[PDB]
């Protein structure tokens, strides 16, 4: 709304989790730069009093900072003039059973802001709007039902007078949908499903008119056998982007359920699709399915980054996205035209390539999955070569600094029944480091990309996956947190490490920045968890436990322990 726009245009504020409507996750603040970053020091810290994974990052509105924790989803408001005083706090009362239906740690990616309110959700499916100054609850509504395996983890997204919220739960057969609510009253505007009839999916009359070969009408049911689409997955729990001039918002729908591909023949549309939908009506103008008939859990919910750059000398409104499947996609955000579809790392073998003319991946049968067969050395793994991290873009050098994962896997599916409220996966996995690391043990990479060609400019290897993402600040710095516990700053020119600090625990969120009283501050949550930390957080030892992540991250416990909090830095 107008209030949010006011904040967005205020220097030093941080009202949106992704950095702005375009989700470039950057900042023009240049007080801290390459020549003085070595002098950055800790300013203050704050514990949430909760353990488990602490994803996302705080919001800063005016002289107020809003911090969020993992389940039970507590909210703390602090006035920056005195970080030692909690102005107000909201501590939800939720049934502990809610944790049992969450696939990947009890995480929360953050808060949103709009119309003078903090918009927050709870894992148990409630969505609330609280007065930003007092914490008083203006409205509270139900969005998901844990009884059927649906929970809330993603950050809400506010555009104009609408709040976008999507439930999680594809691992439990939850049919995905983006829900739109009125910012002021909480009233349901509309709901757009990922599978089913065209009416339920909400397709515009001119849906994909520019690219008919992507598929148009009736595919939400036709690309499935029988009523399998009813428990077909496609949940969107990642990030959104919005273009005010076109009034289109963008996001990706998740993986189809179950993981056992043999139990769901068909392209399974419209799971793993990049969407361009009208904010007012929710009607899709265009949609591109990245991974037809998923066989690897490449949940297509990753960040959408909007940029305007010249493509072969021609200025074009773009949308870029690095999917779990290891492909970097760049499309015209106006009509969905496919421009770039390149592997982020040569290890990707599930596809030979993505054919730009047919618009579909050329599958390599040797790395497919199927019943009564164990696939091996499949790259990327289900964790993907990119997960929930929020990356940054430097508009001057026109570079995207991506936090990547370099993990591959072995996979064998198995038959299982669907029972509402219970897990519906159907696959046994083993995950391990990819083949390209210097010592073949490295699982993380910070890699700079040109979004118009898909070519990399430089690479920095990390022992563990770069799960949280990166932040770019005009001073020429790429900031990011590591699973092993460090907040680091790199020279954006070559990836050279210029500064670092050992936080209490690994970080799985992306750093943020703000200004207060003329000083630039960098903030980062800490508290390892999420999928990579499941073994550590739940004391698991079986290598195949945690959907196969336990074995791959067994060494993490020798570098960090759980935690939960925020650390702020400045000159």
């Amino acid at each position: 709304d107008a209030d949010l726009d006011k904040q967005v245009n205020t220097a030093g504020a941080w009202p949106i989790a992704t950095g702005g409507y375009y989700s470039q996750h950057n900042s023009p603040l240049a007080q801290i730069n390459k020549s003085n970053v070595k002098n950055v020091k800790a300013a203050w810290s704050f514990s949430t009093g909760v353990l488990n994974g602490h994803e996302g990052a705080p919001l800063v509105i005016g002289d107020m900072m809003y911090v969020h924790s993992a389940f039970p989803n507590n909210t703390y408001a602090l006035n920056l003039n005195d970080p030692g005083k909690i102005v107000w706090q909201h501590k939800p009362k939720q049934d502990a059973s809610t944790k049992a239906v969450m696939c990947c740690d009890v995480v929360d990616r953050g808060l949103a802001y709009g119309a003078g309110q903090i918009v927050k959700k709870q894992a148990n499916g409630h969505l609330l709007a609280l007065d930003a100054k007092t914490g008083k609850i203006n409205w509270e509504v139900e969005v998901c039902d844990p009884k059927v395996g649906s929970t809330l983890t993603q950050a809400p997204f506010v555009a104009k007078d609408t709040v976008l919220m999507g439930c999680s739960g594809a691992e439990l057969g939850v049919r995905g949908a983006v829900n739109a609510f009125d910012l002021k009253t909480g009233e349901l505007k509309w709901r757009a499903f990922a599978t089913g009839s065209d009416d339920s999916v909400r397709l515009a009359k001119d849906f994909n008119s520019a690219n008919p070969h992507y598929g148009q009408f009736g595919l939400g049911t036709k690309t499935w056998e029988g009523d399998a689409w009813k428990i077909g997955g496609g949940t969107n729990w990642g990030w959104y982007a919005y273009d005010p001039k076109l009034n289109l918002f963008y996001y990706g729908s998740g993986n189809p359920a179950p993981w056992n591909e043999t139990m769901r023949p068909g392209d399974n549309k419209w799971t793993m699709t990049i969407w361009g939908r009208d904010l007012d009506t929710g009607m899709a103008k265009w949609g591109y399915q990245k991974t037809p008939h998923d066989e690897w859990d490449f949940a297509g919910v990753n960040q959408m980054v909007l940029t305007d750059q010249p493509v072969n000398g021609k200025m074009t409104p773009l949308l870029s996205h690095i999917d779990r499947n290891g492909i970097l996609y760049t499309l015209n955000r106006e009509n969905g035209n496919l421009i770039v579809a390149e592997k982020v790392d040569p290890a990707v073998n599930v596809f030979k390539k993505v054919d730009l003319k047919t618009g579909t991946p050329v599958r390599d049968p040797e790395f497919a999955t199927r019943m009564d067969h164990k696939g091996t050395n499949i790259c990327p793994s289900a964790m993907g070569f990119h997960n929930q991290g929020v990356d940054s873009y430097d508009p001057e050098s026109r570079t995207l600094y991506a936090g990547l994962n370099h993990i591959c896997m072995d996979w064998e599916p198995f038959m299982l029944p669907y029972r509402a409220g219970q897990f519906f996966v159907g696959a046994t996995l083993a995950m391990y480091p990819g083949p390209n690391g210097p010592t073949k043990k490295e699982m993380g990479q910070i890699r700079a990309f040109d979004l118009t060609t898909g070519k990399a400019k430089w690479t920095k290897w990390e022992k563990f996956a770069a799960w949280g993402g990166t932040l770019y600040t005009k001073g020429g710095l790429v900031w990011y947190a590591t699973l092993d516990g460090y907040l680091k700053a790199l020279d954006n020119k070559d990836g050279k490490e210029l500064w670092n600090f050992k936080m209490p625990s690994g970080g799985i969120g992306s750093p943020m920045t703000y200004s207060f009283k003329g000083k630039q501050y960098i903030g980062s949550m800490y508290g390892v968890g999420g999928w990579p930390g499941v073994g550590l957080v739940f004391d698991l030892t079986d290598p195949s436990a945690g959907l196969g992540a336990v074995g791959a991250f067994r060494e993490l416990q020798n570098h960090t322990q759980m935690g939960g909090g925020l650390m702020v830095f400045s000159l």
């Binding site: 409205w139 009884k147 392209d267």
Partner: protein
């Protein structure tokens, strides 16, 4: 199955060698229970009903209360 053989635009799925074109009646038949499949729809309807009551009440009470029914 290389994903390039489409019987219709946007529909390029093919059964892998040795697997059935249709799983109904095959050894891979999921045999989904129609009763279980409709659970989500039943949940969303009841949920929407509860929210509607909360909104209406607030709009006609100036005060919003969640536990209302």
């Amino acid at each position: 199955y290389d994903g390039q053989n489409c019987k219709e635009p946007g529909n390029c799925w093919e059964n892998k060698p040795g697997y059935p074109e249709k799983i109904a009646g095959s050894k891979y038949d999921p045999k989904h229970d129609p009763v279980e499949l409709n659970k989500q729809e039943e949940s969303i309807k009841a949920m929407d009903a509860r929210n509607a009551k909360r909104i209406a009440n607030a709009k006609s009470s100036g005060n919003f209360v969640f536990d209302v029914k």
